[PDB]
């Protein structure tokens, strides 16, 4: 129920948002994995530029 | 002769009995620790004549003689001999206590050091 002066809001929380919540607890692990793969590629192409063409 | 304090004023206490919780006599599930009654129809809360009293702020003790043991000293808890040099200069006003956890062999040394420093101990012959 509305109260004294305030903003009228529209939260999109009427579906079942809790059965699909994407947390980011593996963000550091993903960064480490990406940079390890990057280094592996950089040293598998020995003299070529790391960033590609 | 024990160690007398600096001054021994007449200690006046506004009440000696404790404040027991309402209906703590009737039940065992209700302990005597005070809880403020909050019932709508409760005669102790509404302070009817002849009921249990309540802990007002008016029962507070005189600030000059507050926290004062019957001997005229204020308690202090000691766990080892290094914290009697603290009371070395609070000599005539504060006494010492050996914590219940301290073993007998350290309780001894605490007792003789306190005797040397003229600090009064209220439990000097506790365990032996």
């Amino acid at each position: 129920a509305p109260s004294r002066n305030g903003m009228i809001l529209k939260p999109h929380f009427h579906k079942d948002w809790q059965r699909r919540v994407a947390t980011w607890f593996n963000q550091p692990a993903r960064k480490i994995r990406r940079r390890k793969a990057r280094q592996a590629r950089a040293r598998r192409i020995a003299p070529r530029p790391a960033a590609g063409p | 002769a024990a160690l007398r304090p600096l001054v021994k004023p007449k200690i006046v206490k506004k009440r000696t009995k404790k404040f027991i919780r309402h209906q703590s006599d009737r039940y065992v599930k209700i302990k005597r620790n005070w809880r403020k009654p909050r019932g709508i129809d409760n005669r102790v809360r509404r302070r009817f004549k002849g009921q249990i009293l309540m802990p007002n702020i008016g029962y507070g003790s005189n600030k000059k003689t507050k926290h004062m043991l019957p001997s005229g000293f204020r308690k202090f808890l000691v766990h080892n001999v290094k914290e009697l040099e603290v009371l070395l200069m609070c000599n005539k006003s504060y006494c010492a206590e050996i914590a219940h956890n301290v073993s007998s062999k350290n309780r001894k040394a605490i007792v003789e050091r306190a005797a040397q420093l003229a600090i009064r101990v209220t439990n000097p012959n506790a365990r032996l």
């Binding site: 002066n5 305030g6 903003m7 009228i8 809001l9 529209k10 | -």
Partner: protein, 187 residues
């Protein structure tokens, strides 16, 4: 019994700064001593403002300070701000200034010093003039915050230019029925 009311017995003003800044509390100790042991109301005002919150000591601008210091009569006096002196980029020429302030932004400091002014902390101000004589006490606009355009007579009430709380400004947001005259009525 006595026939009185106890609603307004307790005053609400601050007695100490709400903050825990140790430098601020040293300043407060100093100015408590000065206000108690002198007869100048300048020190009383200064510590009263030291007690205040940030919204009650808004930033002051070089433009306001320069204008108020070039007002006639108050030549080469010390401007005093119990807030923050911020830089104002839409001002070209900076005169010589003698400012005392709690904190000054880096570009404001650079401008003032390059123009040849002098910036003081409140301990130096106390050393220089214990009674705060020769000083012009200023403050920032206290109702400049955006929050204040939402206050007062409620929007949607005749003759009330109050800003409403809208999630977003646009064509479809709170513009039809209490706003037009075609769509029903106009407030």
């Amino acid at each position: 019994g006595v026939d009185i009311r106890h609603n307004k017995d307790r005053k609400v003003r601050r007695k100490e700064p709400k903050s825990q800044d140790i430098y601020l509390r040293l300043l407060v100790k100093l100015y408590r001593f000065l206000a108690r042991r002198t007869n100048s109301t300048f020190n009383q005002v200064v510590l009263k403002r030291l007690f205040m919150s940030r919204t009650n000591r808004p930033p002051l601008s070089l433009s306001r300070m320069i204008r108020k210091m070039k007002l006639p009569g108050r030549e080469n006096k010390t401007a005093v701000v119990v807030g923050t002196v911020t830089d104002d980029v839409r001002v070209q020429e900076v005169p010589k200034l003698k400012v005392c302030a709690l904190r000054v932004t880096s570009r404001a400091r650079s401008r003032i010093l390059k123009a040849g002014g002098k910036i003081l902390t409140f301990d130096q101000l106390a050393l220089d003039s214990p009674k705060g004589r020769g000083t012009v006490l200023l403050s920032g606009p206290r109702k400049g915050r955006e929050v204040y355009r939402h206050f007062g007579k409620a929007p949607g009430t005749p003759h009330s230019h109050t800003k409403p709380y809208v999630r977003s400004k646009g064509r479809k947001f709170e513009r039809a029925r209490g706003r037009r005259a075609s769509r029903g009525y106009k407030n």
